[PDB]
Amino acid sequence: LGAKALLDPRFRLEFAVSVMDRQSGNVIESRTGSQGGSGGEKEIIASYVL
Amino acid sequence: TLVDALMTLLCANPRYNLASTGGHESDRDLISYVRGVSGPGDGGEGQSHI
Numbered sequence: 001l002g003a004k005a006l007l008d009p010r011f012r013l014e015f016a017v018s019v020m021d022r023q024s025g026n027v028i029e030s031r032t033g034s035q036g037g038s039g040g041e042k043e044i045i046a047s048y049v050l
Numbered sequence: 051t052l053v054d055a056l057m058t059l060l061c062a063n064p065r066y067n068l069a070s071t072g073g074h075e076s077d078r079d080l081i082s083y084v085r086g087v088s089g090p091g092d093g094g095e096g097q098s099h100i
Contacts, residue, residue, distance in 0.1 A: 027092045
């Protein structure tokens with residue numbers, strides 16, 4: 001991992017997903033690391049981002 | 051989660067939520083079940099996720 005961090009651009013960032021309300025810019029829910037979510041939770045996020 | 055609860059009894063080091071990653075890795079600890087941590091809360095100090 002380290003020898004990726006030190007020489008490759010796209011390994012210097014952690015990615016995260018957030019949910020925002022139309023009527024409010026306040027976070028409704030944001031997820032990264034320790035998903036702790038059912039299998040069905042994953043596949044939605046997957047398909048939508050892709 | 052029900053199956054995870056049962057699995058804590060039969061195993062030396064049961065891998066919780068295994069079927070989420072097709073056999074790759076486990077995501078959840080043991081304590082969060084006791085704490086009833088309903089997913090990862092929002093970063094605005096949260097406390098609504100436990």
